[PDB]
Amino acid sequence: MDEFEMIKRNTSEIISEEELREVLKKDEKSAGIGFEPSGKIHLGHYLQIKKMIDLQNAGFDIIIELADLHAYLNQKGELDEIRKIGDYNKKVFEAMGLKAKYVYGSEFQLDKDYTLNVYRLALKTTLKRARRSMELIAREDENPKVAEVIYPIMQVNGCHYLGVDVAVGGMEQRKIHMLARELLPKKVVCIHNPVLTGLDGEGKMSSSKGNFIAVDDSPEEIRAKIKKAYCPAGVVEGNPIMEIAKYFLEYPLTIKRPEKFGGDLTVNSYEELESLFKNKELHPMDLKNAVAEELIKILEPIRKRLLEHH
Amino acid sequence: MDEFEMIKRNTSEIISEEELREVLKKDEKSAGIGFEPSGKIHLGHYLQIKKMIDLQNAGFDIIIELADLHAYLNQKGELDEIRKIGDYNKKVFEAMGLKAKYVYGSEFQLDKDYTLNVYRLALKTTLKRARRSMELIAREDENPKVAEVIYPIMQVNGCHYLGVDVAVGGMEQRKIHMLARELLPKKVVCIHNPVLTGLDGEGKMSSSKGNFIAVDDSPEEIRAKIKKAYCPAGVVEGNPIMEIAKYFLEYPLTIKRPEKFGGDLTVNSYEELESLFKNKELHPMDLKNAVAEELIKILEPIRKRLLEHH
Numbered sequence A, B: 001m002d003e004f005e006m007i008k009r010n011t012s013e014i015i016s017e018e019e020l021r022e023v024l025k026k027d028e029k030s031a032g033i034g035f036e037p038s039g040k041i042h043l044g045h046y047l048q049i050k051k052m053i054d055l056q057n058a059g060f061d062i063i064i065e066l067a068d069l070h071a072y073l074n075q076k077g078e079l080d081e082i083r084k085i086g087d088y089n090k091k092v093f094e095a096m097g098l099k100a101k102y103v104y105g106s107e108f109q110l111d112k113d114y115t116l117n118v119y120r121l122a123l124k125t126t127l128k129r130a131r132r133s134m135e136l137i138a139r140e141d142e143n144p145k146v147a148e149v150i151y152p153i154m155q156v157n158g159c160h161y162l163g164v165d166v167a168v169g170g171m172e173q174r175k176i177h178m179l180a181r182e183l184l185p186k187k188v189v190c191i192h193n194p195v196l197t198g199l200d201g202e203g204k205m206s207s208s209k210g211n212f213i214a215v216d217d218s219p220e221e222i223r224a225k226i227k228k229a230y231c232p233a234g235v236v237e238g239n240p241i242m243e244i245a246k247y248f249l250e251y252p253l254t255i256k257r258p259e260k261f262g263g264d265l266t267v268n269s270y271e272e273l274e275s276l277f278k279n280k281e282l283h284p285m286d287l288k289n290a291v292a293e294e295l296i297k298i299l300e301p302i303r304k305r306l307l308e309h310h
């Protein structure tokens, strides 16, 4: 498991693999990601932070953008309230064990030269290309605002201004990332993580859809959320419980169940688990119990560090 | 002819007349207009500058924006070349007899607080409203740029930042102006001048359509441009020669013609001229001769001041 495959583990795509290999050669290399401040930090965020921790462990300097101005452009409210939530998110990201530089976007995204470059990019980005890149990001609006098409080019320029070698994000960021690769003089290596399914299976996990496990949920809340979740026997695709087993749990994995249902089960890889699940050797109730208890233990240190403040 | 009707003469609309009357009450009041720098200054510009001269004569302080950044957003090239053309335009506007403050937009349109307010406005302006306001302004593009929708909200904010009581422009600016009236806390009085017809009658006069008389055209060039112009007998609407008689000439007007065509004609108002033209008492050839020679004399001082530099 070289550093490449360590970075590559559980990503949806790397754009591009050859470029990432060149970047690994450098003594000095930086990786960046941004987050619109969120009232709750959920497993979708945690997935990203894990991936930033991998990069850090491969010798990357990590830059986290607390994207207060992007959230302002995406209709999350007033900058001061956004910035307060930004500060809470940093604490959560630190309680996740991430050592990084944290910057508020508004610290640099309003300088004369940043703005001028945003306007340069606005001359090279068609409205159609801009609106396409925001399809999975833009706040739902029957009357889309001009702010929606400023957003993607400000994120592009952020890549430029921060000078990262690698940009990380969920797959929803990939069209903004493609735009950065076409417009900017230095091509940024782009690493896209999968988009988790919502707990009810009905769509993608979102802080505004209320279908997530938050990293500071109480254990009873974790158990009740898993218990209700979409999780049909033998169905792996779009199954948020299997996604959690694949993305967050440690193997080998011991799955406790009564002797009358086969007794404790040990699986040495998520791949074995998927096999046991597909040919319906492992029942959804037992998968849920094991996933909930392991997730509880995995999230425990984070919830404890956050509760230590009170 | 109070100051109101003097300001109102030969305008298409005043938004609104009651508001303009309130503004006239003030000892201190300012009027503003912007121009994307243009290689040639034509009668469309001159019409506007005349209207600024009226306002000045009514006691307005005049602010002319040399809109280098708007022209940059509207694909007129590089800022330095735009700014050079900006400087030429000022000279022309001064040779027209306008005493005013001249500012390059880029002097203030990149400050942190200006930019932040542009982004505030971008949150309140729908893409559809923004693209509607640019229909008569935007450079022709099969693939419209994001820059096209930044333009109108930057012009709105310019009104705000410069604090004018009155905004002046051609009718094509009216939708941007309407947006300023809805978004800004202080409603700006908007004065819209007519859009001149191109010399060939086929559309509106434009510096990029090459259908204009420039204020520094030589007399032979003026005569040849008038001679070729669209100008059908009895047709007033869309007739650029009548527009010039209405908007630029001084009355009473003596129209020279041979005795065999009726001999010299004196008309005491454009209204008489329109009457003589409609019931086909005045032939297009004689109208053209008179319009060209009077326009030559009217533009003479401007062409001379511009030529004095060489």
Ligand SMILES: CC(C)(Br)C(=O)Nc1ccc(C[C@H](N)C(=O)O)cc1
Binding pocket: A032, A033, A034, A035, A036, A063, A064, A065, A067, A070, A105, A137, A155, A158, A159, A162, A164, A167, A168, A169, A173
């Ligand atoms: C400048 C660097 C490279 Br650190 C960066 O990635 N900036 C960035 C990234 C993502 C977001 C939010 C995002 N579009 C979302 O959907 O939440 C905002 C800013």
Ligand SMILES: CC(C)(Br)C(=O)Nc1ccc(C[C@H](N)C(=O)O)cc1
Binding pocket: B032, B033, B034, B035, B036, B063, B064, B065, B067, B070, B105, B137, B155, B158, B159, B162, B164, B167, B168, B169, B173
């Ligand atoms: C700030 C004040 C009030 Br002085 C102003 O009117 N600014 C302004 C006006 C017009 C233009 C150009 C115009 N859209 C065009 O079509 O040429 C650019 C800037």
